[PDB]
Amino acid sequence: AGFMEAFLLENRKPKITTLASGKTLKPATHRLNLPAYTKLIHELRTKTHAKVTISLSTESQIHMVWVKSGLVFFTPSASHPAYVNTPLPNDEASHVASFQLVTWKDGALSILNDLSKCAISFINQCEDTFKSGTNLNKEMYNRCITAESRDFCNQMKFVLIGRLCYGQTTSPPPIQLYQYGVTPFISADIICEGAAYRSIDVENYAMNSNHLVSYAPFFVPNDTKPGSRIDLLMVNHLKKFNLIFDTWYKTGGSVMVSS
Amino acid sequence: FMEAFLLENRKPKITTLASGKTLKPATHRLNLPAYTKLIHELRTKTHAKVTISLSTESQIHMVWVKSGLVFFTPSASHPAYVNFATPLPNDEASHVASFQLVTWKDGALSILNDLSKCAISFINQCEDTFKSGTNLNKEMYNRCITAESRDFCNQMKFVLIGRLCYGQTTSPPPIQLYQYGVTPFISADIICEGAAYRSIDVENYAMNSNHLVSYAPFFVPNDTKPGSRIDLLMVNHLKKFNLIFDTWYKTGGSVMVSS
């Protein structure tokens, strides 16, 4: 699929139902999707990725989180904030049962590059499709601006945080991607034709970008000694466009790979 | 004083679920106080300039036209009719039981001016509060950006259409108000800190604003003759920012005054 149809999937099982005075509203027919993310998850689950093989046991849920040094696959214990069915992970108890670090050179940069290329392609494809005065297919247009977008926002947030961990100061992500990190959810019509920022934020961002990210350890267990390793650094807070408040990432923007 | 534009979210009109978890309803909703004030004054016959003369035995609505403000009582077959719980109006049957035109000079401009001043005040306040580096209370910030906004978007749509009917060509509304007319609704976080448009749209709008509106008759009955009067012109379509598709106003952006 090309153009905007590369970023649309059929909304087979609606992940959103809206209710109003006894009526259940009709679910959107489609959802926004970043195909490179779907492909990555599939390859990791099936052990068919060309550069990275998850070695953790698949009898427990596996998550992944970006750190400054690469990509961490991890199995949270039931007490970890990332666990899917108590003090936050700290230097004495990480609440991580096991982990696997993949450094940039060993495949994490290849993964990030594939994700980033797709995300930037989406941003550019939105300009070509919605902002260039070009004739548009009516059905495709309405599929786009009514599409479910919650999963897509989470995919783009994951790509953003990888870009920041790898290269916040040297290859900063564009504001069109940063916005996913400081707004939990953006509706598809705003993604396609609007923004979670305005023009002043655009000029500001080139100047502010080195100051928008706070990092903190992604705690994991020491293998031969008690306590936690503290040297793996994840995104902890992202400064919002008002430059006063932050969006907090309790688990560094981690996402689930398999259950 | 963003709190001037907030009301308690007493009886939310919708509830939303994500993957079967109901989201917490917002504590507050955005509101345009000049709109609430206007409706109350029209209902209670305490408006300083305009008195509705239609019978209150039936529901009363109002709609902007190029020559002012039309109060009307729709019949059950009219698209604006609201029940306790079919062909569109045309030059033969308006489905309007009675109407009252108030010209700009006889009070409609005063009404529009009070609404417009409030809406422009909101737009300017959003800049002062969210884009000026001003210290803000964290709780108040989150109350604003999580607020429900559907009713507010409808209020802003009404002000916008009045601005267009009165002075599309001579005093065009700003894009910060036009956006409410080409989006079904905008969430509060996007209203406060983002937009339903992007930077290129600002320059497009400066050039296009005299060409974005299609008008059509608001059909009302001829009083001495069969059929409908066809010379009262309401907003029928507003061109979206992509410049291809339009938002349709089946009843010219009419709103209910009294039930």
Author numbering:
A (entry chain B): -2 to 82, 111 to 284
B (entry chain A): 0 to 84, 111 to 284
Give excerpts from the publication:
Cytoplasmic polyhedrosis viruses (CPVs), like other members of the order Reovirales, produce viroplasms, hubs of viral assembly that shield them from host immunity. Our study investigates the potential role of NSP9, a nucleic acid-binding non-structural protein encoded by CPVs, in viroplasm biogenesis. The disordered C-terminal region of NSP9 facilitates oligomerization but is dispensable for nucleic acid binding.
The purified NSP9ΔC existed as a dimer in solution, as confirmed by SEC and analytical ultracentrifugation (AUC), with a precise molar mass of 60.5 kDa. The purified NSP9ΔC was crystallized in an orthorhombic space group P212121, with unit cell dimensions of a = 82.4 Å, b = 83.6 Å and c = 184.4 Å. In the asymmetric unit, four molecules of NSP9ΔC were identified and organized into two virtually identical dimers, with a Root Mean Square Deviation (RMSD) of 0.6 Å. The final refined model achieved a high resolution of 1.80 Å, exhibiting favorable stereochemistry parameters and refinement statistics (Rwork = 0.18 and Rfree = 0.20). The overall structure of the NSP9ΔC subunit revealed a compact architecture composed of 8 α-helices (α1 to α8) and 13 β-strands (β1 to β13). The NSP9ΔC homodimer exhibits a distinctive awninged ship-like structure. The dimerization interaction of NSP9ΔC involves an interface area of approximately 1536 Å2 (11.5% of the total solvent-accessible surface per protomer) between protomers A and B, and approximately 1177 Å2 (9.6% of the total solvent-accessible surface per protomer) between protomers C and D due to the lack of the awning-like β-sheet II pairs, both larger than the homodimer interaction of MRCV P9-1 according to the PDBePISA server. The arch-shaped structure contains six positively charged amino acids, specifically R9, K10, K12, K20, K23 and R28, which span residues 8 to 28 and form the tunnel. The elucidated structure identified a positively charged tunnel surrounded by a compact NSP9ΔC dimer as the nucleic acid binding channel, thereby suggesting a plausible interaction potentially between the protein and the nucleic acid from both termini.
